[model samples]
Target: MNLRIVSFAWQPGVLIDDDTVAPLAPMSARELIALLPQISPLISDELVPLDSVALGAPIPEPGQVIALGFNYPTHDPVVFMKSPTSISGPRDAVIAPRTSHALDYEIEIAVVIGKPGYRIERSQAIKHVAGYMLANDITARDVALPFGQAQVVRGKGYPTFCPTGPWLFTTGSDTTFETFDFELRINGELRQSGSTVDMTLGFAEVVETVSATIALRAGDIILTGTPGGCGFQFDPPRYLRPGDVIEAHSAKLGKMRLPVHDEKP
Candidate 1:
């Protein structure tokens, strides 16, 4: 069985499973982490209407948020870190810096680590996962590749850059991450579409590779790369602009709609 997840804003923090909208709020990230394996039994009669409550980032205070680039089987996956401050709720506004012209959108899938990990093996990767969620890995092309070179960290750290969660779906082992097809649209026009099946490096191996050097603590987020058909591929490029709307959908994660606005200078 699959569990639908949500975080709340009423308490400044609360992690709820498919069980109930009003289950007791997790007191600490440690309490949240300790409860993952026991999630099913913890499902209770407590109920809170989802639509009536304010929403918060699912992993309210994620320990680390890591993202990947170019894992489409065409090149090796390159990794990067996104500041936790950049994290926003799925419904949060995405601010496009007025100073940059090459802003872009990437519909990506991310994994939340439950079990602590160090030098983890591919065979053991999935077990360490608490669940998965969809995210838009917003990028500023001009900032990242100013003149055909990369700035690496700076370009990817814009405020309100990484938007995740309408909810997290805690899946059973039978639900696989590698075959889901997803797409992104701008103002109702389809812009990007692809499946995780096309990934150059599989999910398990991706985690295995990262944990080899960095230890993964509970609440860490690891983003798998996006598929092709991004705005960057267009001849003239159809980068995001104010008043534009982005709609993204996936078989596993449902859909997310985000409003784009230019940061006022």
Candidate 2:
């Protein structure tokens, strides 16, 4: 079963498929965190048809947007956060902030938190997952590195740096800590391609590691990580430009295509 929170007719609501629930506007990040376990009952009537309204980011205003960096065998495990202000929906333009000369793309599978959890064991990771969706970890590579270290905090702080959605898939069953094929293409040229099976940290450890410090909220976002083959690792790093179209997709989650735009004038 695929589920999503959406906005339609200028009204924010929840949709299951043609069964539009009255209040489309979603609760705040703080509010949702406190109400996670009870969300199903509150939105029971809102499970409208999938086509009932326009789709939005699964959780638009996540209080905490955490990402796992280089979990693949080719890289080390690094963590970063996307600011609350950088969130955007599928098909939305990811703005290339003026400060960056090299914008990079990371195609990843995002986990949507369904239940609040702290110190969650690996065996219980699935219980906290509400669903899965496609996400673009749009990054500013030139500005991402400072003193030879990836400045994840500053790299993800730019507005419109994160693009997610289209829909959430709740029915897929394969959760093995094995590699899953994923690819990234820019303007039709394949750039980065790899799989989770190649990850060094794996999901179980990642979940266990992340839950150690902060409680995972209902709408919190977790970007697993990116594989090698990124443009930045090339002989001479390639960067994004205005009008460039980036497409990222995985077998489990659907595809997400985002267009790049210049910073606000």
Candidate 3:
């Protein structure tokens, strides 16, 4: 069964049929996140057409937005924090910060935590996962890597810098992160791509690593890092310009189509 959980303007719901949704009882996505540990009790019987509502970010207000850098077969698992306010919907506009000329894009798989725990054992890490979402880690390269030095926090912390969710791909019986594939494109041209199986530090390890000191909460998010084809690597860096559209895709996680616009001065 292909079940997807979505957050609309009014409530959160799960797809009961291919084109319809069964509204869950949680008044907010955050409340729904808390109930993710056992979904059986929250699923209600009322149905609505998927297209009849506006979709918002899967977890609209994540308590903490943790991300890992250089995570793919690569300092790997370089964990960092992005401001929770940066979260935006799948098709929301990505604003290019006016102070920087090196705007870049990173398409990644994001994990949402359901069962909170601290210092979780790697052997039992999978039990904490709620599901997954597609994410775009929009960055201002000049700010993130000034003089070739990484300052990820501020560079990737701008509003609308994190575009995520069409809906959450809630974990199922056959779900395995290793089998997921992802990619990114700009104006229909491929820019980056990779599979989760290649990650140097997979989700289990990441959870164990991050939760070592910080406590994992029900709505916390972790971005698994992007693949190699970032625009800054090209001969003449192909940074994003106003009007450019970035599309991040994953067959199981859903897609995000974000339009780029210059920040108002």
Candidate 4:
């Protein structure tokens, strides 16, 4: 089932179905994370229907947001951190920093942490997962490559750089180890398209490699990286501008659309 948390009349609530009330549904991300394990067979039908609710970032205020770069091919995985300030709700505009001219979009499958672990092995990594969501690794391509080399770290860490969610999917049975089709559209034209099978690093290696360096805490998120059809790979290297619209989708996760806005000077 699709699981989501929303706000009704300025109060947080959970959504189970199309007609459910706000507060009577499931708990907020923070509250659910704390109680999910203890609450078994949480039934969505028992919740109330909400009248007016606002959508918030699915995992609002996550402890950390770790991302994987270039994991889709033979390239080594590049890991980066997005500050909490970078988090924004679905359909939110991602501000293009003044220092960048070539901004790009990466559509990725994101893993939300359910439990804390250190040195988590591949076999056990899935257990730590709470669910999945859509993520846009909005990038600053000009700043991403300095002196003609890739700047994976500097390019991805800017404030308001990461955009995720229309909602979170608590049902994990739908996703497979195989590749999922993905694409990005600018306005109405398609720009990038590929499949998750293109990923060279794979999920097992990503979990193992990253866990070696840092502890995985509850509410942390991991972006599995993107396939190669980004604007940077083009001849002229298209970049984003204020008022531009970006839409991304994956087979199992769903769609996320965001507008581009100029950063505050």
Best by lDDT: 3
Consecutive 10-residue window with the lowest summed lDDT within model 4: 170-179
For all predictions, the C-alpha RMSD in Å is 3.2, 4.4, 2.6, 3.5
C-alpha positional error of residue 86 in candidate 2 after TM-score superposition, expressed in Å: 1.1
Model 3 weakest lDDT span, ten residues long: 38-47
Off by over 4 Å in 2: 2-54, 171-180
Residues 1-265, candidate 1: write the lDDT tens digits: 4555666753423234332355455425434654666654445323265666666667767888899999774326788988877787777778888768878898888888888999998988887887787888888988888888588676778877888876666644444444578788988999878777788888888889889888998889888898877778888898888888888888767567789998888
- Residues 5-27 of candidate 4 have per-residue lDDT tens digits of 44342245555555563563423
How does each model score on lDDT? 0.75, 0.69, 0.81, 0.69
Using TM-score as the measure, name the better of candidate 1 and candidate 2: 1
User: Candidate 1 at 136: error in angstroms?
Assistant: 1.2
Superposed model 1: Cα runs more than 4 Å off: 10-30, 44-52, 73-75, 173-178
Better of 2 and 4 by TM-score: 4
| Superposition error at 48 for model 4 (Å) | 10
TM-score of candidate 3 relative to the true fold: 0.90
Minimal lDDT window, size 10, model 2: 1-10
How many clashes in candidate 2? 14
- Which residue segments of model 4 deviate by more than 4 Å? 1-15, 18-28, 45-53, 149-153, 171-179
**Residue 170 lDDT, candidate 3, scale 0-100:** 71
Off by over 4 Å in 3: 41-52, 173-178
TM-scores vs. true structure, each candidate = 0.87, 0.78, 0.90, 0.83
